[PDB]
Each structure stands twice: as C-alpha cells, then as structure tokens.
Scaffold this active site. Sequence first.
Site, PDB file in Angstrom:
ATOM      1  N   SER A 157      -5.976   3.349   3.569  1.00 57.26           N
ATOM      2  CA  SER A 157      -5.428   2.322   2.690  1.00 57.26           C
ATOM      3  C   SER A 157      -6.518   1.540   1.932  1.00 57.26           C
ATOM      4  O   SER A 157      -6.318   0.389   1.561  1.00 57.26           O
ATOM      5  CB  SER A 157      -4.539   1.371   3.491  1.00 57.26           C
ATOM      6  OG  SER A 157      -3.476   0.969   2.672  1.00 57.26           O
ATOM      7  N   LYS A 177       2.835   6.487   5.315  1.00 54.30           N
ATOM      8  CA  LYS A 177       1.972   5.526   4.653  1.00 54.30           C
ATOM      9  C   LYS A 177       2.592   4.158   4.823  1.00 54.30           C
ATOM     10  O   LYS A 177       3.738   3.939   4.451  1.00 54.30           O
ATOM     11  CB  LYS A 177       1.799   5.828   3.162  1.00 54.30           C
ATOM     12  CG  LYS A 177       0.935   4.794   2.419  1.00 54.30           C
ATOM     13  CD  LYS A 177      -0.554   5.017   2.701  1.00 54.30           C
ATOM     14  CE  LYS A 177      -1.383   3.788   2.378  1.00 54.30           C
ATOM     15  NZ  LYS A 177      -1.268   2.774   3.456  1.00 54.30           N
ATOM     16  N   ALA A 195       1.268  -3.621   4.037  1.00 56.71           N
ATOM     17  CA  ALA A 195       1.476  -5.020   4.383  1.00 56.71           C
ATOM     18  C   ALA A 195       0.980  -5.862   3.222  1.00 56.71           C
ATOM     19  O   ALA A 195       0.042  -5.467   2.514  1.00 56.71           O
ATOM     20  CB  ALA A 195       0.741  -5.384   5.672  1.00 56.71           C
ATOM     21  N   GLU A 240      -5.083  -3.816  -7.047  1.00 51.01           N
ATOM     22  CA  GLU A 240      -5.452  -4.394  -5.760  1.00 51.01           C
ATOM     23  C   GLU A 240      -6.455  -5.526  -5.987  1.00 51.01           C
ATOM     24  O   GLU A 240      -7.402  -5.378  -6.758  1.00 51.01           O
ATOM     25  CB  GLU A 240      -6.062  -3.337  -4.828  1.00 51.01           C
ATOM     26  CG  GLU A 240      -5.103  -2.249  -4.334  1.00 51.01           C
ATOM     27  CD  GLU A 240      -4.025  -2.749  -3.386  1.00 51.01           C
ATOM     28  OE1 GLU A 240      -3.986  -3.965  -3.067  1.00 51.01           O
ATOM     29  OE2 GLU A 240      -3.236  -1.893  -2.920  1.00 51.01           O
ATOM     30  N   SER A 275       0.784  -1.243   0.000  1.00 51.63           N
ATOM     31  CA  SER A 275       0.000   0.000   0.000  1.00 51.63           C
ATOM     32  C   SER A 275       0.823   1.305   0.000  1.00 51.63           C
ATOM     33  O   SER A 275       0.259   2.390  -0.212  1.00 51.63           O
ATOM     34  CB  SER A 275      -0.971   0.015   1.198  1.00 51.63           C
ATOM     35  OG  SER A 275      -1.935  -1.022   1.046  1.00 51.63           O
ATOM     36  N   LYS A 296       0.283   3.768  -2.805  1.00 47.27           N
ATOM     37  CA  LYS A 296      -0.893   4.638  -2.883  1.00 47.27           C
ATOM     38  C   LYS A 296      -0.528   6.130  -2.774  1.00 47.27           C
ATOM     39  O   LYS A 296      -1.237   6.983  -3.327  1.00 47.27           O
ATOM     40  CB  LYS A 296      -1.922   4.216  -1.822  1.00 47.27           C
ATOM     41  CG  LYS A 296      -2.558   2.861  -2.169  1.00 47.27           C
ATOM     42  CD  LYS A 296      -3.292   2.197  -1.011  1.00 47.27           C
ATOM     43  CE  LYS A 296      -3.886   0.859  -1.476  1.00 47.27           C
ATOM     44  NZ  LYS A 296      -4.346  -0.031  -0.383  1.00 47.27           N
TER      45      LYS A 296
END
Length: 263
Positions: free
Chosen positions: A105, A209, A212, A141, A45, A48
């Site tokens: 996230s 930010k 995982a 994602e 993440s 992002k």
Amino acid sequence: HPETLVKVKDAEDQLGARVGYIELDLNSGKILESFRPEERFPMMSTFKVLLCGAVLSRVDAGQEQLGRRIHYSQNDLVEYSPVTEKHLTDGMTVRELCSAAITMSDNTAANLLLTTIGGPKELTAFLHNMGDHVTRLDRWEPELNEAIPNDERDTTTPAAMATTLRKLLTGELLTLASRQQLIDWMEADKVAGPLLRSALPAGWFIADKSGAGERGSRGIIAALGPDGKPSRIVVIYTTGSQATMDERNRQIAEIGASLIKHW
Ligand SMILES: [Xe]
Ligand SMILES: [Xe]
Ligand SMILES: [Xe]
C-alpha cells in the site's frame, strides 16, 4: 446468507457508522448478498488495484512496459512509503511500483503510477470507459483519504467496486497475462492480515487489498474461495466511525467469519 447481513447490521450498530457490503459470484457475476450497495464510501488504498488495472491496460496496448524504470526524488516521498523510500538512487520499475502499491500500500508508488497514466482524472476516465460511471478518483495520496462526510471525491459504491473488480480480474478488458499479474499482486498483500485473512481457513485462496483513512474509514476488496481457487468477490467499506482501528478490523473479520461459515 441472511446471517452475514445480520453481522453487517451488527457492525453498523457497534461502530455507529454506515457499512457497505457485496458478495459477488465470480463466475456468473450474480450478486449473492448486498447491503447499501448504491451508497458511496471512500475507496482509500483499495483504489490502488484499479490504478494498476489501468497501468496493465496500457502495458497491453504497448503504451507502458512493466520493466520501464522510473527515477524520482526525496520531494516525491509522501507519508507511508515503505518501499519507494528505499530506491531514491536506483529507481523502481513499473512492475515494482505496482507490487509496492498493492502488496504494501505504498503511497508514493501510487502517486508515481498515477503520473504514468495522467492522474486521477485519467484513472476515472479509464473506469468510465470500462463501464463504471460511478467510481471516481479526484485526488492524490494522501489527500484522497480525507473522507469528509458527504464529500463524493475519491469514492465508489460497493456494487460499482465489486463489478469493476470482477471485470478487471476475469473480464474481457485485460490480457490473460495482465489479469494473472493483477491477481498475483493482490494475493501477495502484506497489509491486510487482521481482516478477511484472519477468518480464512487453511487451503483457501485469497487475493485482496485493504484501505484505511480518516474519519473511521476502513475497507477491503477481495477475490477468495476454497480449495486454492477464488470463486467469490467480497467488498466491505465503512466510514464515519470513531471506533479504533482494532475494532474496525475485528468487525470486518467477523463479517468474514460469517461469509465463510455460510459459504
Ligand atoms: Xe480472481
Ligand atoms: Xe466493517
Ligand atoms: Xe474470509
């Protein structure tokens, strides 16, 4: 500080996995410490922030507007979409989608934003054009979190990510307004609590930010500093460990404690 690299080495030993690390002076761009700086790690993440950097570049160019409203459907919702699952009827503005992507996230928010810029290849083209020829986003994602060993898809290096983040937050690319918006979103991060934040003394600034993914992958990117002002960028990644999330969190927090102690 040497003692911080010892903690990173400690973390490698105890996690049974590679750890990458960079400390970067924000103002001068000097690397102060590094560990495995040219090795690849899954971004998870942490990508992002780069995604919304690309979105803000389009906003600056007038190719995008922060108030533009996007509608979407139940079929768009992928795993972990705590904000986007709440607005199937009303939709969300691009601003709200970046806030959801960075502060919570939200995965569907990230995919919707990726669609606005033309997908992973266009994020990678964006990074390429700001001088990062190392970082690559290949998938959406949640497949981008797969972290297959030695698979280079959806990876960065600690050095590439740190210098790219420095350019986004303080460099010539984005307008002053967009730089401030990107760091404001990062400052409002709600899902990095047990990481660098857990070592941060009162009155310090942090904008961060975390990420995982599969196969023990864990990481964080951050701009932080004393007296309510960021002055350093810190990047930490790890992948490959069988350790629990709790232990991976605690390793990152320890590394943070040492960075703070020897600031
Ligand atoms: Xe910053
Ligand atoms: Xe770590
Ligand atoms: Xe920290």
